[PDB]
Amino acid sequence: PNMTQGFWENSMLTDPGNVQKAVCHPTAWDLGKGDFRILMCTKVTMDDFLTAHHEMGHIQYDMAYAAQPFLLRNGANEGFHEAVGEIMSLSAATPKHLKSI
Amino acid sequence: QCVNLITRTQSYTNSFTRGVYYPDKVFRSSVLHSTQDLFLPFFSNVTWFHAIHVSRFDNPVLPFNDGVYFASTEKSNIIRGWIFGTTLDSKTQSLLIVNNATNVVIKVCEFQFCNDPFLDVYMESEFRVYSSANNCTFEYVSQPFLMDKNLREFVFKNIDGYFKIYSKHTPINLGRDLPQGFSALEPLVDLPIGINITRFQTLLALHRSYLSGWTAGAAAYYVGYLQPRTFLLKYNENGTITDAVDCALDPLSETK
Amino acid sequence: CTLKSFTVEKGIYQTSNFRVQPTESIVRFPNITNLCPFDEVFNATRFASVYAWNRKRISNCVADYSVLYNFAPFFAFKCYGVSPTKLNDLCFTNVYADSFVIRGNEVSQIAPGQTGNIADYNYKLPDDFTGCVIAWNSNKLDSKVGGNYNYLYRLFRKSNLKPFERDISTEIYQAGNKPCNGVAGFNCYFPLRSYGFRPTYGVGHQPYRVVVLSFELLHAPATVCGPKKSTNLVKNKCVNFNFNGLTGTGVLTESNKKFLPFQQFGRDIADTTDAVRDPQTLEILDITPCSFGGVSVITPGTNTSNQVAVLYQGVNCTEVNVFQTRAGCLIGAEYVNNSYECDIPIGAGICASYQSIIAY
Amino acid sequence: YNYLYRLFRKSNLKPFERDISTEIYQAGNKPCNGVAGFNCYFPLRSYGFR
Ligand SMILES: *[C@@H]1O[C@H](CO)[C@@H](O[C@@H]2O[C@H](CO)[C@@H](O)[C@H](O)[C@H]2NC(C)=O)[C@H](O)[C@H]1NC(C)=O
Ligand SMILES: *[C@@H]1O[C@H](CO)[C@@H](O)[C@H](O)[C@H]1NC(C)=O
Ligand SMILES: *[C@@H]1O[C@H](CO)[C@@H](O)[C@H](O)[C@H]1NC(C)=O
Ligand SMILES: *[C@@H]1O[C@H](CO)[C@@H](O)[C@H](O)[C@H]1NC(C)=O
Ligand SMILES: *[C@@H]1O[C@H](CO)[C@@H](O)[C@H](O)[C@H]1NC(C)=O
Ligand SMILES: *[C@@H]1O[C@H](CO)[C@@H](O)[C@H](O)[C@H]1NC(C)=O
Ligand SMILES: *[C@@H]1O[C@H](CO)[C@@H](O)[C@H](O)[C@H]1NC(C)=O
Ligand SMILES: *[C@@H]1O[C@H](CO)[C@@H](O)[C@H](O)[C@H]1NC(C)=O
């Protein structure tokens, strides 16, 4: 499934400016109650594109188990959560995908 | 706050040819139309009630039968409405008709009516009419039908779900209260009530004394009962019922 | 064809009936007033919690289902037992409007045969529910940045709710064996929990306002009937008239009859309608039925000639070699001022003969 | 769900007439233009036989 409207409304995908300071680390946030955000200071590079795919994979993983109870809203183990983003980082980096887009 | 204040005496008089109403809303001009409906019979026994409050329970609840003819020569402020129902308590639905100086409120709820209900003016309070009103299913507020020597006639019917009220105001020259001649009662309201009505009671207004809590008063009214009867009504050039014959009164009227 | 013969003897034969066909349909239904208060329920500034769901009875008005259709934000307009298309014509005795606010994920639970927290403990519909459910997003009215803590729901209850039942009790839910004694803690939880609505929630959790319309019929006459369209009035023509459920076909001419204010229709000596009052504008019209006539064919013998003349009995010549007689309109015969003996009788002193066909 | 019925149609059918046309119905004032959506529903619905 595609992204929610609140994801596009509430995520800050660009560095805000000098006046407002923010953490530049790429982080995917599952705030709860169907609210999913990405904190990313995007630069126009291939690396930020792959990192955006990784964090959107994190957000999709968080999005899929929303029907589960709150204390079970995590990966089955600690490897799965990063693995499902790293497979997107693998697939997006292929020459075929770059020729496609 | 139910208090017993009204005592009532009764006499018997003659209806003459009073009580005729328009049986439908169809214009008929210069014709003789025979209709079978609930009518007050000609020269029938009508009970004249005098209700007196002086400053025990002696104001019983009257039956409704198939409909009631009501008449009064009193002013518009003394008699202020009526109560209709079967048990007159919270277990069955009931209809309350209350008139005041500005409008009339007709309202069907589950009223827990008092044994001697009366509207008291002080503003007007209905706490002496009933003690509670729950599960209320109908309300209708409209222009009043007790306005201003003047004889006021009403016909109440409860037919197949609808409560029909017919009224007329006739200026009677000083004399006998029930006059001769004809004055047909125009249809006033048809209310989609759909309740069972077997008993009724008249509402009077009492004033506070401000000095035997209520001022002494008297009210005279005539009550007759409608019966399934066939009438022959005369419609004149302008559509008004100016005359009628009661088909079962005497052999001459039967021939007519 | 009428005489069932190929040879017709000289004379006048009544063969058909002329009629004036109805041209338009005029459905002057009762004037549309006192529309049902759907603005009070749908456009209320404050809705109710789902545990204390608001119920409003609707009676003695005209139920307008077009305002509902006009509103765009509706997420569900799902109807049960009656079609949405035939809402305006089929009519009922009482209409119950139940209003509450829930979360988006639970909107599927407002249906017959469904299970969940809302269906079992807050609002239950029967399996034979006849009515409609309407839901729409209410972020701009019910979401607060600090959190809207004024919407509550029942999470715990001993038994499931019956259809159309409410529970406003605040008793502590006793889930174990020990008595709660009115104080919360372990195995004793308060059943009413707050719907803390915030504008940044996901679509399954945004506040949705739900109105459930339940229609019921009883032995009483049904009085919540949807408004019937009242088309324009056309006079002086043969139009099918439907005035306040009284139907017919006839010309509606101006009337000199002064009706009394309580009268609606008018009748003849022989109890046939001759007048009516328009329910939109308080005017009196003389209903006169459209012209009809006995078509008679005047012909000599087929041995002599095949020329025919047509007499429309009782019909004026302007409503159908055209001559006007007291018998009716004669078409196909030429009036001659000469007088002869009667050959084919027409009526009122008029006779027809063949010499062409002449009338005299 | 193999058995379907025509819930919505513009007009009633004739005797011994079969309608198998899977075209959309316009249930409101707004035209649907052949695409499902708000107040635009498919005429043929399946029975939930259990
Ligand atoms: C006459 O009766 C009417 C009907 O109840 C009274 O009008 C109402 O007054 C109340 C005040 O408590 C208002 O809330 C309502 O809106 C009024 N209704 C209408 C239809 O106007 C009126 O006050 C009464 N007059 C007297 C002198 O008692
Ligand atoms: C997601 O896809 C659905 C249909 O697949 C569409 O209706 C919706 O608008 C899309 N959302 C966004 C944010 O593009
Ligand atoms: C009216 O009824 C009373 C008793 O109910 C009776 O005594 C009286 O004679 C009656 N009057 C007439 C005119 O019948
Ligand atoms: C009438 O009221 C009582 C309590 O006031 C209630 O228990 C009962 O169900 C009500 N009945 C109807 C028909 O509203
Ligand atoms: C109306 O009430 C009376 C008295 O309570 C009763 O005898 C009668 O059967 C009732 N009518 C109906 C239709 O229930
Ligand atoms: C009927 O109406 C006409 C015209 O308004 C009027 O002149 C006449 O007095 C009325 N009454 C009767 C009995 O004709
Ligand atoms: C609510 O308000 C809107 C405002 O445009 C209006 O169009 C509508 O008729 C109102 N009522 C309902 C039931 O939506
Ligand atoms: C009938 O409808 C018209 C429409 O303009 C309105 O003006 C009028 O008040 C309505 N009522 C009556 C009694 O004519």
Q: Is residue B1 part of a domain?
A: no
Q: Are C215 and C92 in contact (CB under 8 A)?
A: yes
Mutate to test the pocket of ligand 4, among B111, B134, B138, B195 (most ligand atoms within 8 A of CB): B134
Resolution in A: 2.5
Contact residues on chain C for A6, CB-CB shorter than 8 A: 200-203
- Residue written as token pair 């020990």: C178
Q: Where are the beta strands (DSSP E) in chain B?
A: 7-14, 26-27, 31-39, 45-53, 62-63, 68-72, 79-85, 94-99, 104-113, 118-121, 124-125, 130-142, 150-159, 162-171, 186-192, 199-207, 217-225, 227-235, 241-246
Q: What is the CA radius of gyration of chain B?
A: 19
CATH number at residue B192: 2.60.120.960
d(Cα B26, Cα B239) in Å, to the nearest integer? 9
Q: Is residue B240 part of a domain?
A: yes
Tokens of B107: 């309202």
Among B250, B37, B47, B49, residue whose Cα is nearest residue B164: B37
Alpha carbon distances (Å) from C68 to B233, C64, C132: 50, 8, 11
Distance between C102 CA and the closest CA of chain A, angstroms: 14
Contacts of B50 (CB under 8 A, 6+ apart): B8, B9, B10, B11, B218, B219, B220
Contacts of A100 (CB under 8 A, 6+ apart): none
d(Cα A84, Cα A76) in Å, to the nearest integer? 12
Q: Is residue B2 part of a domain?
A: no
3-state SS string for chain A? CCCCHHHHHHCECCCCCCCCCCCCCCEEEEEECCEEEEECCCCCCHHHHHHHHHHHHHHHHHHHHHHCCHHHCCCCCHHHHHHHHHHHHHHHCCHHHHHHC
Q: Are C170 and C180 in contact (CB under 8 A)?
A: no
Q: Are C320 and C328 in contact (CB under 8 A)?
A: no
Q: Are C190 and C171 in contact (CB under 8 A)?
A: no
Q: Is residue B45 part of a domain?
A: yes
Tokens of C241: 């008239």
Alpha carbon distances (Å) from C314 to C290, C307, C323, C333, C353: 12, 23, 13, 17, 21
SS3 C205: coil
Minimum CA–CA partner of A63 in chain C: C202
Distance between A98 CA and the closest CA of chain C, angstroms: 32
Tokens of C53: 């769901």
Q: Is the CB of B86 under 6 A from ligand 5?
A: yes
Tokens of B59: 């104001």
Q: Is residue B108 part of a domain?
A: yes
Q: Are A48 and A42 in contact (CB under 8 A)?
A: yes
Helix (H) or strand (E) holding C265: strand C265-267
d(Cα B111, Cα B117) in Å, to the nearest integer? 12
Q: Are B144 and B87 in contact (CB under 8 A)?
A: no
Q: Is the CB of A1 under 6 A from ligand 2?
A: no
Q: Is the CB of C283 under 6 A from ligand 8?
A: no
Q: Is residue B111 part of a domain?
A: yes
Among B130, B79, B121, B74, residue whose Cα is nearest residue B215: B121
- CA B44 to ligand 5 center in whole angstroms: 27
**Residues pairing with C189 in the sheet:** C173
d(Cα C360, Cα C347) in Å, to the nearest integer? 11
- The CA-CA-CA angle for residues B45, B185, B119, to 5°, reads 75
Q: Counting ligands in written order, which one lies closest to the CA of residue B64?
A: 5
Phi-psi region of B30 (alpha: psi -120 to 50; beta: other; left: phi over 0): left
Contacts of C93 (CB under 8 A, 6+ apart): C59, C216, C217, C218, C220, C221, C222, C223, C224
SS3 C107: helix
The question of whether A55 is a catalytic residue gets the answer yes
Q: Are B121 and B215 in contact (CB under 8 A)?
A: no
- Residue written as token pair 């919360």: C184
Q: Are C77 and C211 in contact (CB under 8 A)?
A: no
Experimental method: cryo-EM
**Residues pairing with B151 in the sheet:** B170
Among C213, C51, C209, residue whose Cα is nearest residue C121: C51
Among B72, B74, B73, B70, residue whose Cα is nearest residue B84: B70
Distance between D27 CA and the closest CA of chain C, angstroms: 6
Beta C79-80 vs C251-254: how paired, if at all?
unpaired
Number of neighbours of residue A45 by Cβ within 10 angstroms? 9
d(Cα A50, Cα A7) in Å, to the nearest integer? 19
Mutate to test the pocket of ligand 1, among B107, B122, B141 (most ligand atoms within 8 A of CB): B141
Number of neighbours of residue C249 by Cβ within 10 angstroms? 16
> Are A and C close enough to touch, i.e. 3+ CB pairs under 8 angstroms?
yes
Query: Do C203 and A34 count as a contact with CB atoms less than 8 A apart?
Result: yes
Helix (H) or strand (E) holding B238: none
DSSP C238-256: -EEEEETTEE--BEEEE--
Q: Is residue B33 part of a domain?
A: yes
Q: Are B208 and C239 in contact (CB under 8 A)?
A: no
Q: Which amino acid is at C40?
A: E
Report the number of distinct structural domains present in chain B.
1
- Of all protein residues, the one whose alpha carbon is nearest to atom 1 of ligand 6 is B238
Number of neighbours of residue D16 by Cβ within 10 angstroms? 5
Tokens of B248: 């079962």
| Sign of the alpha-carbon dihedral angle for D9, D10, D15, D16 | negative
Spell B71-102 as b/e; 16+ CB within 10 A means b: bbebebebbbbbbbbeebebeebbbbbbbbee
d(Cα B151, Cα B169) in Å, to the nearest integer? 6
Query: Do C74 and D38 count as a contact with CB atoms less than 8 A apart?
Result: yes
Spell C47-58 as b/e; 16+ CB within 10 A means b: bbbbbebbeeeb
Among C306, C294, C296, residue whose Cα is nearest residue C8: C306
Tokens of C87: 């809402």
SS3 C198: coil
Alpha carbon distances (Å) from C113 to C108, C116, C129, C163, C339: 11, 10, 10, 11, 91
Q: Is residue B92 part of a domain?
A: yes
SS3 C331: strand
Q: Is the CB of B105 under 6 A from ligand 1?
A: yes
d(Cα C20, Cα C181) in Å, to the nearest integer? 86
DSSP C47-86: --BSTT-EEEEE-SSB---HHHHH-S-EEE--EESS-STT
d(Cα B128, Cα C149) in Å, to the nearest integer? 44
Q: Are C323 and C311 in contact (CB under 8 A)?
A: no
Q: Which amino acid is at D15?
A: P
Q: Which amino acid is at A54?
A: H
Among A56, B63, B235, residue whose Cα is nearest residue C271: B235
What range defines the domain where residue B207 resides?
7-256
- Helical ranges in C83-196 per DSSP H: 117-121, 139-142
Interruption sites in chain B after residues (C→N beyond 2.5 Å): 55, 122, 148, 211
d(Cα B186, Cα B165) in Å, to the nearest integer? 9
Q: Are C34 and C62 in contact (CB under 8 A)?
A: yes
**Half-sphere CA count of B245, side-chain side, radius 13 A:** 14
- Helical ranges in chain B per DSSP H: 251-255
Beta B118-121 vs B199-207: how paired, if at all?
parallel
Burial of B17 (0-12, 13-18, 19+ CB in 10 A): buried
d(Cα A41, Cα A48) in Å, to the nearest integer? 9
| Ligand 3 atom nearest residue B14's Cα | 13
d(Cα B205, Cα B80) in Å, to the nearest integer? 6
- Residue written as token pair 């064919």: C297
Angle between helix A46-64 and helix A78-92 axes, rounded to 10 deg: 140
d(Cα C85, Cα C242) in Å, to the nearest integer? 23
